[PDB]
Design a binder for this molecule. Sequence first.
Ligand SMILES: *CCC(=O)NCCCNc1nc(N2CCCC2)nc2cc(OC)c(OC)cc12
Ligand SMILES: *CCC(=O)NCCCNc1nc(N2CCCC2)nc2cc(OC)c(OC)cc12
Lengths: 143, 145
Amino acid sequence: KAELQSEERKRIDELIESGKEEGMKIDLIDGKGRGVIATKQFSRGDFVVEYHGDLIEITDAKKREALYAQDPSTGCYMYYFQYLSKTYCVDATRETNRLGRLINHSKSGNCQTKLHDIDGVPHLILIASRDIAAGEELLYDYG
Amino acid sequence: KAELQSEERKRIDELIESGKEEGMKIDLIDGKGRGVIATKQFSRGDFVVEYHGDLIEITDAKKREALYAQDPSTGCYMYYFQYLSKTYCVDATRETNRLGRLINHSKSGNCQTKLHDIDGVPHLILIASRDIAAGEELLYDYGDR
Ligand SMILES: *CCC(=O)NCCCNc1nc(N2CCCC2)nc2cc(OC)c(OC)cc12
Ligand SMILES: *CCC(=O)NCCCNc1nc(N2CCCC2)nc2cc(OC)c(OC)cc12
């Protein structure tokens, strides 16, 4: 073990809250376009990056969705989930410098999502679903 | 006022439970592209069409989102809402004969959303936000409002 689990949790909390993202970079994938590449090896289970965005409840998510007035054909950055009796939305619509929202989707990726609680506040993170080689495209799937 | 409210509530319920979607058609909208055009007049407040899809709970919404495994850049047909303190999703991903999911979005729209109850079951419907003349493209706004 619990000590090591608590200590790894602390390192994940510190990375999440620091504002820093390492071990990855934006690159153009041949025949695909923009994507995120691992610039270091990842082991199955390792923290990759947060899917960073504003955490809001469903009422505020509806207010935001109504006001963006963006066309739905271009995709949505608002992700919904339930956590301890509440429904939340991680709204990553804002065009920030964060890499989590840039990781492409795949029918079989090397990143999976997990909810990571920080003092009763859930964070949507990407963890490695298998071992990842440096240079591989980071690809998520829901799962 | 209660009589007119009840008569209309029954009119909306019958249309939903019959599958028939009258006064509109699929068309190449002038100067834009594919959409839905009104083929009759609609007064402000009138029922236009339901945003038809599978009504599911959040657990099943997560499983479907995981199974479709679609590229998120092409848009999403899964609409999340709260009704009587419970979370729902109307999933219109399936390509059916239904027109509601084909109505284009616009903040300058002529259709607004409303949650319409049928024996405790919420249905997401589109209602005319203003008068709509025949030949106008139907366009939705997410607002109530
Ligand atoms: C990030 C916000 C977002 O994209 N939300 C998507 C909500 C579900 N998708 C969707 N919803 C509707 N509605 C909901 C309320 C009545 C009309 N119409 C849609 C229409 C289209 O295309 C015409 C799409 O395309 C993906 C999605 C719709
Ligand atoms: C109809 C299903 C759907 O489109 N769901 C949208 C979910 C929110 N959008 C979104 N989410 C993520 N996540 C969620 C869990 C970690 C990764 N990544 C996204 C990435 C991209 O592009 C790279 C988009 O593009 C619109 C949306 C994402």
